[PDB]
Design a protein around this ligand. Structure first.
Ligand SMILES: Cc1cc2nc3c(=O)[nH]c(=O)nc-3n(C[C@H](O)[C@H](O)[C@H](O)COP(=O)(O)OP(=O)(O)OC[C@H]3O[C@@H](n4cnc5c(N)ncnc54)[C@H](O)[C@@H]3O)c2cc1C
Ligand SMILES: Cc1cc2nc3c(=O)[nH]c(=O)nc-3n(C[C@H](O)[C@H](O)[C@H](O)COP(=O)(O)OP(=O)(O)OC[C@H]3O[C@@H](n4cnc5c(N)ncnc54)[C@H](O)[C@@H]3O)c2cc1C
Ligand SMILES: CC(CO)(CO)NC(=O)Nc1ccccc1
Ligand SMILES: CC(CO)(CO)NC(=O)Nc1ccccc1
Lengths: 587, 587
């Protein structure tokens, strides 16, 4: 396998040096390259147990067995004498810049995965271009470099969640002795939006600066792959041209869906529009039941809004349903109205006021499963009914990249498509968790395999999540129902408990609402298959346990670890009530 | 070893039944015991790989080899026929209540460890008494059942820390769009104290109820062990008497120290007085540099107080000193004044006003190492210069319990003292981390070994901690300097990074102040020896990683785990900058 690995590494690396840490000839080559500003990968054979065999395999390309050996785009360039010869004759820059293609890497899509991949590739001498374009929403909203998370996703959504959490901080502060009157304080939507957007703008700019400082070419242009190595680009002035690249990474993400009902596209909005909305939403209907639907409904209500969520069947399909029910129950007790077993069939009553920055007014008609009609007025209607790629705008069908029935790219476990120089990362990679840290790990690990000879793959199993609803829900591993489906009910033990944060005591909040559980496999030493927690700071609670689950933690490992007091997370270290026992989990 | 274990178990268990889950004769004995309200331990031999051998060893006491076999205080009572015989003749209650001693267990001290031990022991039929008495402070402060943490420790200190955190929540809420003016809001100390004390009172009462519901005898009396099995008690009316017990658990904790300078006892206070203080402290001097000193100084300043800390040498001796310096630097930038390299030499200017509930006024004189004099007026002076047991008030020297040079009890790894029926748990156990979850685990695990045949020991290694200063500091494992001392500098690699909470962006708080590091051992697969984090919610961040460290996590385990976004804790999953490299950790 050593020989297979070396051949793949030489063929794909842009500029790579084989070396040993103790060789002065290697040092002199490194210094020459560093003086001429030639970036490159380095593999130190004396730090690999397999290095003596690698040194022998090198001779298949170079006909020598010594170090240093330097390669450019699949071709042996020289040993120490040869490299210094090129340098002395001002020949080196020309050799290390010679390519069949304009770029070693073209990334189509400048989001979480695509930016991480392009920056990492450039570190190893890959001449890289990042393409990004933001197709405007139906009402015309657009934004800058950085993708869905930075502009219309994790970042603004958690900042608005923080604004909602502070409403309860203001309430709590009275009980802890502070002299404010919460009932006389109001929230200004546009003041919050301006602060959120000023931070997003600093991220847009920071990404352009980072690309420039890594020598990456940034093009604000729509990309379309028309053959394995050719990308057609259309710029802001509609000028069309073609660039070529050796490796291609598709990283174009998804966009929100609309239901096919009259008025939906013309009068409703999505999460794409919400985070820069110039007017306050007012009385709002959220249609949908995804984590996006519930997170948005949740902070709108905490800011003081009149909020309804219209649910076709269940909440958070695909998540543990006991946990999802507890999430929704908390929201209903804290102001959110729910129209259950209900679907929509939208009429405009008032146009948005772009002068006084005030919302319009809409009539929503729908129906319930019991036959009753739904008819109610709202100032804003938000659709959160899923997301999808539109790869037909990115990818000519004749190139030969295989898609699945949902239109996502079918990849091997190293992100390779059915076209061997083309790779896909992030939300468009079929079957993978659709999360920002996953896309970043995929893109960075892929760049190292392509251009630095790395072997490490991304591990997509047991990736932890957090839903940032008013009471947050964190999880890692299997839901209880999926564990029982896989192993049978007799092989599953579930430990659980309610708890109360210490911070809730003086504030007079609820006793037996926060909740956690460990779903375990009896016949495998009580292995922890899934961990679930409903409570404040659930993302901070969950993260560290994801390392232990990755390592195969059992119930005994949780028991022998001592808790930190006073914390919410410490309740995981002393769990003892099983579901099979029927004993109540309440405190 | 099976035979040794069985003999120890029979001798010490109060009421114990040997059984198999599938035996109907065992079931009938369980039902009779449950009807007569006789609590007991149960060991199911068919759930132990060693059970066939245990069944044979039982014959050394009973001369039979069948199940069920029932034992009371070291004596075989009978098989199924014999037990039902006693029940039918109204003889059973008399047999299971027969003892040489008043109690199977006496616990001296009703705190974290002592309450946990007494409640667990009672579950297995041990007739238990818990003794608790609170010696008043010099000014007369006293409190109810539950020990140091509940009354004058973790619980009130974290609630007052929460009150201080809310000051910054009020400030932040303006930037997130809320219409309050922080500069017009004040804090009322006594309103906060009343709420904190109402919660503590609910815990005092809940413990008395829990003891009553477990059939534990609670005596509010000072205990003194005068021989291995005799405890002399003095009650609230000064009446003296003697009770006897089979096993004794010493769990009496520590109390604050004072420096030996004029005026210290008469005019200063300690943490024992602070948490129920009827007047606001006003301009305050904290003398000391322990986690107690810095936590108290920190929340007093966040509530709006004029606070000075007087430091003899370093902060947080025994903790990682880079981390301790960052903690103190944050406090100094946020209002706390520090009198460095300074010691005190206290005069009264005004007596405390017990009518208008206002503090007095004090003159503090001291001196610096450079020869300058310290002289300044303060309304309150708090000493936080360490804590100590006073076991000469608990333990007659003739009993034979060995103490160390600091006066703590010298124990084996199962908490046994040099007197074989006497055990020590919690803060008075020499050499152990002095923390509430440690005391609870020790007491509960000990009760199960004494009265239910358990074998599991408490693991005191790599127990995680959190200091609840204004910016919190969490840790698990070795400090960097201790790791280098143990293994040498060439064998240690340190990965580190600054970070900024997303919540701090819109609030305009500091860029490169939060900080984390992983201290690793190169020659052991980059094993993580210590983890350290300075930031919000540091206790929630740290707890879950303590399970992975207990399991032997390496740097590779941290790398392959995916982060949760956006969280502070996720920065641990992507660390790459080493200290040896000299690259800056800033963002
Ligand atoms: C409301 C919401 C909240 C979320 N919250 C979280 C959260 O808390 N945590 C989390 O981990 N994940 C969260 N996510 C998911 C996260 O945003 C995505 O998983 C992540 O952004 C995926 O990144 P990506 O690189 O696959 O694509 P994207 O980030 O979508 O970036 C793709 C980019 O390519 C551009 N593009 C498309 N076609 C072309 C073309 N032809 N030419 C050029 N450019 C093109 C797009 O306009 C976009 O800029 C959230 C998502 C949403 C919608
Ligand atoms: C200010 C402060 C803050 C702290 N914060 C934390 C924190 O955040 N987290 C943490 O884990 N730990 C914290 N601790 C430590 C924690 O309080 C102790 O580790 C824990 O209380 C130890 O419990 P214990 O059972 O050993 O003794 P204690 O809790 O002290 O209980 C012993 C009891 O025995 C009584 N007693 C003494 N002598 C006799 C006698 N002769 N007869 C009868 N009764 C007697 C005492 O009055 C007391 O009620 C803090 C401590 C302090 C002082
Ligand atoms: C406890 C329980 C179990 O089902 C009711 O008994 N909760 C819900 O049903 N919560 C919910 C809230 C809003 C929308 C959908 C579900
Ligand atoms: C960065 C550094 C390093 O020493 C100063 O250069 N910090 C301190 O010294 N912090 C500190 C604050 C209060 C009391 C004691 C120490």
């Amino acid at each position: 396998g050593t020989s297979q690995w070396l051949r793949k590494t030489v063929d794909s690396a842009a500029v790579i040096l084989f070396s040993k840490t103790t060789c002065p000839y290697c040092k002199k080559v490194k210094d020459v390259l560093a003086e001429a500003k030639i970036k490159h990968a380095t593999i130190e054979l004396d730090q690999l147990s397999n290095g003596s065999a690698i040194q022998k395999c090198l001779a298949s390309f170079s006909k020598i067995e010594t170090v240093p050996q330097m390669f450019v785009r699949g071709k042996f360039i020289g040993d120490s004498q040869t490299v210094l010869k090129y340098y002395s004759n001002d020949e080196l820059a020309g050799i290390v810049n010679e390519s069949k293609y304009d770029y070693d890497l073209i990334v189509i899509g400048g989001g979480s995965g695509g930016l991480a991949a392009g920056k990492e590739a450039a570190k190893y001498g890959a001449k890289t271009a990042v393409l990004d374009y933001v197709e405007p929403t139906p009402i015309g909203t657009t934004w800058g470099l950085g993708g869905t998370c930075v502009n219309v996703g994790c970042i603004p959504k958690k900042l608005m969640h923080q604004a909602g959490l502070l409403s309860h901080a203001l309430e709590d502060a009275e009980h802890f002795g502070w002299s404010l009157d919460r009932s006389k304080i109001s929230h200004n939507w546009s003041t919050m939006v301006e602060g959120v957007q000023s931070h997003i703008g600093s991220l847009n700019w920071g990404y352009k600066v980072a690309l420039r400082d890594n020598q990456v070419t940034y093009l604000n242009a729509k990309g379309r792959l028309i053959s394995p190595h050719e990308v057609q680009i259309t710029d802001k002035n509609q000028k069309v041209s073609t660039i070529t690249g050796n490796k291609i990474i598709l990283a174009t993400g998804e966009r929100p869906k609309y239901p096919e009902i009259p008025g939906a596209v013309e009068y409703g909005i999505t999460s794409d529009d919400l985070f820069s909305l110039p007017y306050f939403p007012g009385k709002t209907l959220v249609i949908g039941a995804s984590y996006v639907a519930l997170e948005c409904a949740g902070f709108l209500a905490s800011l003081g809004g009149d909020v309804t969520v219209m649910v076709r069947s269940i909440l958070l399909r695909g998540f543990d349903q006991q946990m999802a029910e507890k999430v929704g129950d908390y929201m209903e007790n804290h102001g959110v109205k729910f129209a259950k077993l209900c679907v929509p069939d939208i009429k405009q009553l008032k146009v948005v006021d772009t002068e006084n920055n005030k919302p319009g007014l809409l009539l929503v008609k729908g129906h319930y499963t019991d036959g009753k009609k739904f008819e109610e007025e709202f100032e804003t209607v938000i659709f959160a009914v899923g997301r999808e790629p539109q790869l037909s705008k990115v990818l000519c069908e004749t190139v030969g990249v295989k898609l699945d029935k949902n239109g996502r790219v079918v990849c091997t476990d190293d992100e390779q498509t059915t076209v061997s120089n083309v790779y896909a990362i992030g939300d468009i990679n079929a079957g993978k968790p659709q999360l920002t840290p996953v896309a970043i790990q995929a893109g960075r690990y892929l760049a190292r395999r392509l251009f630095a000879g790395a072997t490490e793959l991304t591990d997509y199993s047991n990736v932890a999540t957090t839903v940032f609803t008013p009471l947050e829900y964190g999880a890692c591993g299997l839901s209880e129902e999926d564990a029982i489906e896989k192993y049978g009910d007799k092989d599953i033990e579930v430990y659980h408990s309610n708890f109360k944060p210490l911070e809730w005591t003086v504030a007079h909040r609820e006793d037996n609402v926060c909740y956690m559980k460990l779903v375990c496999r009896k016949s495998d030493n009580m292995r922890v298959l899934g961990l679930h927690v409903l409570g404040p700071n659930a993302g901070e609670i969950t993260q560290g346990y994801a390392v232990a689950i990755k390592m195969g933690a059992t119930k005994a490992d949780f028991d022998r670890t001592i808790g930190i007091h006073p914390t919410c997370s410490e309740t995981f270290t002393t769990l003892h009530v099983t579901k099979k026992s029927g004993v109540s989990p309440i405190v």
